Design a protein around this motif. Structure first.
Motif, mmCIF file in Angstrom:
data_model
loop_
_atom_site.group_PDB
_atom_site.id
_atom_site.type_symbol
_atom_site.label_atom_id
_atom_site.label_comp_id
_atom_site.label_asym_id
_atom_site.label_seq_id
_atom_site.Cartn_x
_atom_site.Cartn_y
_atom_site.Cartn_z
ATOM 1 N N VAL A 221 23.301 45.743 39.164
ATOM 2 C CA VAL A 221 23.684 44.506 39.718
ATOM 3 C C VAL A 221 24.005 44.561 41.208
ATOM 4 N N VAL A 222 23.648 43.494 41.919
ATOM 5 C CA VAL A 222 24.168 43.339 43.281
ATOM 6 C C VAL A 222 24.748 41.932 43.328
ATOM 7 N N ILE A 223 25.960 41.790 43.847
ATOM 8 C CA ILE A 223 26.528 40.464 44.101
ATOM 9 C C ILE A 223 26.742 40.438 45.625
ATOM 10 N N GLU A 224 26.015 39.537 46.285
ATOM 11 C CA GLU A 224 26.103 39.408 47.716
ATOM 12 C C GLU A 224 27.297 38.565 48.013
ATOM 13 N N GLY A 225 28.171 39.061 48.879
ATOM 14 C CA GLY A 225 29.393 38.336 49.204
ATOM 15 C C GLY A 225 29.163 37.108 50.041
ATOM 16 N N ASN A 226 28.346 37.274 51.079
ATOM 17 C CA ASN A 226 28.018 36.258 52.098
ATOM 18 C C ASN A 226 29.202 35.362 52.444
ATOM 19 N N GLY A 227 30.263 36.032 52.909
ATOM 20 C CA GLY A 227 31.508 35.383 53.316
ATOM 21 C C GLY A 227 32.607 35.610 52.289
ATOM 22 N N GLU A 228 32.280 35.470 51.002
ATOM 23 C CA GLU A 228 33.278 35.622 49.946
ATOM 24 C C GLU A 228 33.664 37.071 49.743
ATOM 25 N N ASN A 229 34.925 37.279 49.371
ATOM 26 C CA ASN A 229 35.416 38.612 49.065
ATOM 27 C C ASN A 229 35.005 38.964 47.647
ATOM 28 N N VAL A 230 33.913 39.704 47.521
ATOM 29 C CA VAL A 230 33.375 40.057 46.200
ATOM 30 C C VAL A 230 33.673 41.523 45.796
ATOM 31 N N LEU A 231 34.767 42.076 46.304
ATOM 32 C CA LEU A 231 35.115 43.449 45.984
ATOM 33 C C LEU A 231 35.257 43.592 44.477
ATOM 34 N N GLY A 232 34.593 44.547 43.882
ATOM 35 C CA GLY A 232 34.710 44.751 42.420
ATOM 36 C C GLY A 232 33.870 43.849 41.495
ATOM 37 N N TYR A 233 33.171 42.860 42.055
ATOM 38 C CA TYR A 233 32.429 41.911 41.224
ATOM 39 C C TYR A 233 31.262 42.489 40.496
ATOM 40 N N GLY A 234 30.564 43.424 41.150
ATOM 41 C CA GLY A 234 29.438 44.008 40.548
ATOM 42 C C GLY A 234 29.854 44.647 39.253
ATOM 43 N N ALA A 235 30.959 45.398 39.263
ATOM 44 C CA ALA A 235 31.418 46.050 38.040
ATOM 45 C C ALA A 235 31.891 45.068 36.950
ATOM 46 N N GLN A 236 32.535 43.973 37.346
ATOM 47 C CA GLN A 236 33.012 43.035 36.327
ATOM 48 C C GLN A 236 31.775 42.391 35.646
ATOM 49 N N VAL A 237 30.805 42.027 36.482
ATOM 50 C CA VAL A 237 29.585 41.413 36.039
ATOM 51 C C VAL A 237 28.796 42.383 35.157
ATOM 52 N N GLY A 238 28.674 43.639 35.583
ATOM 53 C CA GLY A 238 27.914 44.652 34.851
ATOM 54 C C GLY A 238 28.468 44.908 33.451
ATOM 55 N N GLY A 239 29.759 45.147 33.373
ATOM 56 C CA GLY A 239 30.362 45.355 32.055
ATOM 57 C C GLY A 239 30.169 44.158 31.123
ATOM 58 N N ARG A 240 30.470 42.955 31.620
ATOM 59 C CA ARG A 240 30.282 41.782 30.775
ATOM 60 C C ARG A 240 28.816 41.611 30.325
ATOM 61 N N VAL A 241 27.847 41.883 31.208
ATOM 62 C CA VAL A 241 26.425 41.695 30.822
ATOM 63 C C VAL A 241 26.120 42.743 29.771
ATOM 64 N N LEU A 242 26.479 44.001 30.032
ATOM 65 C CA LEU A 242 26.305 45.039 29.053
ATOM 66 C C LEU A 242 26.864 44.674 27.659
ATOM 67 N N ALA A 243 28.146 44.352 27.584
ATOM 68 C CA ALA A 243 28.735 44.002 26.308
ATOM 69 C C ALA A 243 28.027 42.855 25.574
ATOM 70 N N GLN A 244 27.760 41.737 26.275
ATOM 71 C CA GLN A 244 27.040 40.578 25.658
ATOM 72 C C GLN A 244 25.646 40.955 25.185
ATOM 73 N N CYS A 245 24.903 41.689 26.024
ATOM 74 C CA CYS A 245 23.602 42.135 25.637
ATOM 75 C C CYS A 245 23.681 43.054 24.437
ATOM 76 N N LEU A 246 24.693 43.921 24.355
ATOM 77 C CA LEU A 246 24.811 44.789 23.151
ATOM 78 C C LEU A 246 25.067 43.992 21.883
ATOM 79 N N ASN A 247 25.808 42.904 21.994
ATOM 80 C CA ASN A 247 26.060 42.067 20.847
ATOM 81 C C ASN A 247 24.726 41.436 20.441
ATOM 82 N N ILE A 248 23.953 40.966 21.422
ATOM 83 C CA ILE A 248 22.621 40.401 21.120
ATOM 84 C C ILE A 248 21.830 41.426 20.319
ATOM 85 N N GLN A 249 21.751 42.681 20.811
ATOM 86 C CA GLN A 249 21.060 43.789 20.080
ATOM 87 C C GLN A 249 21.594 44.010 18.658
ATOM 88 N N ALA A 250 22.913 43.972 18.464
ATOM 89 C CA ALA A 250 23.486 44.149 17.116
ATOM 90 C C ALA A 250 22.967 43.064 16.180
#
Ligand SMILES: *C(=O)[C@@H](NC(=O)Cc1ccccc1)[C@@H]1N[C@@H](C(=O)O)C(C)(C)S1
Length: 414
Positions: free
Chosen positions: A385-414
């Motif tokens: 994942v890349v989250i472009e800040g473009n003014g916004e303080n996006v520190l840590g967003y990539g990781a929050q987004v990555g974990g949530r996508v991973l978990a939801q996608c794993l549920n889809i797989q289950a």
């Protein structure tokens, strides 16, 4: 040829995203259900905006003197359809996670490189082509990877047998390397700590020493074994990720390159400069015992008869690091998420591992990165994942987004 019906483009789970409709006129109008889903991947053939995606990379697949007669140009034929590897449900997950941000996400099967979700933001609908957005940020935009690149540095240092996860490093707030000053984020003096901990906390001072110990030839060679310099994708277009000619590198340049910052000044390009897709290929090869796969997005082709004309075979780009090396890298990435800078990617009930990164861009803004895999034991999915800040303080967003996508996608797989 406008009386020739073009084939469909379908998802793995049977959602048609492109299809041709015969008009009373005889000609066919290209329609797009769920318009707006996987736009960059599905693509378009436009005089004005050019060509992109499957519509263009599988164009010919989709596209006797019976041939003269336009009146029979349809009875005789129909184009073959394309079934993607994209899973519509995982695709929605990624698209929802990007709402309100610019950036991108890729989700892939680590054992084959099958791309299961691929999304770029902002996006557009095909309807809008009738009137930033067009850039596919998963594959045709380059970025400084920042600390996400340290996965390569680490993998190289271990594989060459120059270091181990428990080898201690000095991780001071600032240090002088090759006439220049490398610094930890906020000039944090972390003291003497094991490499696993320097990796987890993402120390630039510690990883820069690994970089310098490895040398430019090793850092480039390993970056290339992970795919840098290759136009990744068996059946889609990716701009190659870039590294310099090692001979033109300086020790300071090498120091920052090893932390993911490209500062080189020479004839060859500065590096590293990565695509989001290349970041996924690194995560996948680590999750996959060091075997790098050439990503792909078409599963199979079908004749109008709903019959299988061909199937893609997964293909390897080689073994970048040994299995033993990959296992140590995986263990290090588990630490980033469990006790380091990737704690935001944790999702209760699932075990996730990855590497984060943050990189300054133009006008004082920054981008947030995350690569990772799940479940930790017998990974079945990888995320980039890349989250472009473009003014916004996006520190840590990539990781929050990555974990949530991973978990939801794993549920889809289950
Ligand atoms: C690697 O990405 C490192 N990033 C920086 O030192 C530069 C930087 C740029 C803008 C804001 C903050 C820092 C280190 N790794 C990141 C990360 O893992 O996300 C840190 C923010 C932890 S510093």
């Amino acid at each position: 040829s406008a009386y020739v019906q073009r084939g469909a483009i379908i998802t793995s789970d049977g959602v048609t995203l492109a299809e041709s409709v015969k008009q009373d006129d005889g000609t066919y109008v290209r329609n797009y259900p769920h318009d707006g889903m996987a736009s960059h991947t599905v693509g378009y053939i436009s005089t004005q905006y050019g060509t992109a995606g499957i519509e263009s990379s599988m164009n010919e697949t989709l596209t006797d003197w019976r041939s003269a007669l336009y009146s029979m140009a349809g009875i005789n034929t129909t184009g073959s359809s394309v079934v993607l590897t994209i899973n519509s449900q995982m695709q929605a997950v990624a698209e929802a996670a990007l709402q309100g941000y610019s950036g991108s996400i890729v989700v892939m099967d680590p054992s084959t490189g099958a791309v299961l979700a691929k999304a770029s933001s902002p996006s557009y609908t095909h309807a809008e082509l009738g009137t930033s957005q067009l850039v596919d940020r998963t594959t045709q935009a380059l970025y400084s990877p920042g600390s996400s690149f340290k996965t390569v540095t680490l993998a190289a240092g271990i594989d060459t047998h120059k270091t181990t996860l428990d080898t201690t490093y000095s991780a001071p707030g600032t240090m002088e390397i090759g006439g220049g000053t490398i610094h930890n984020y906020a000039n944090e003096d972390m003291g003497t700590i094991p490499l696993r901990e320097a990796f987890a906390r993402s120390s630039n001072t510690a990883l820069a020493q690994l970089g310098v110990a490895l040398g430019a030839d090793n850092l480039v060679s390993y970056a290339r074994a992970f795919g840098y310099g290759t136009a990744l994708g068996q059946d889609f277009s990716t701009t190659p990720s870039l590294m310099p000619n090692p001979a033109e590198m300086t020790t300071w340049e090498l120091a920052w390159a090893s932390c993911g910052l490209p500062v080189g000044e020479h004839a060859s390009p500065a590096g590293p400069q990565t695509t989001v897709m290349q970041n996924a290929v690194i995560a996948a090869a680590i999750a996959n015992g060091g075997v790098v796969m050439n990503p792909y997005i078409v599963d199979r082709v079908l004749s109008p008869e709903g019959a299988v004309v061909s199937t893609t075979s997964p293909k390897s780009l080689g073994q970048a690091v040994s299995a033993d090396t990959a296992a140590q890298v995986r263990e290090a990435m588990l630490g980033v998420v469990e006790s380091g800078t990737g704690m935001g990617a944790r999702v209760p009930g699932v075990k996730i591992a990855g590497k984060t990164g943050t990189a300054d861009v133009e006008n004082g803004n920054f981008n947030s990165f995350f690569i990772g895999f799940a479940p930790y034991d017998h990974p079945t999915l990888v995320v980039s994942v890349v989250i472009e800040g473009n003014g916004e303080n996006v520190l840590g967003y990539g990781a929050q987004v990555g974990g949530r996508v991973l978990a939801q996608c794993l549920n889809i797989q289950a």
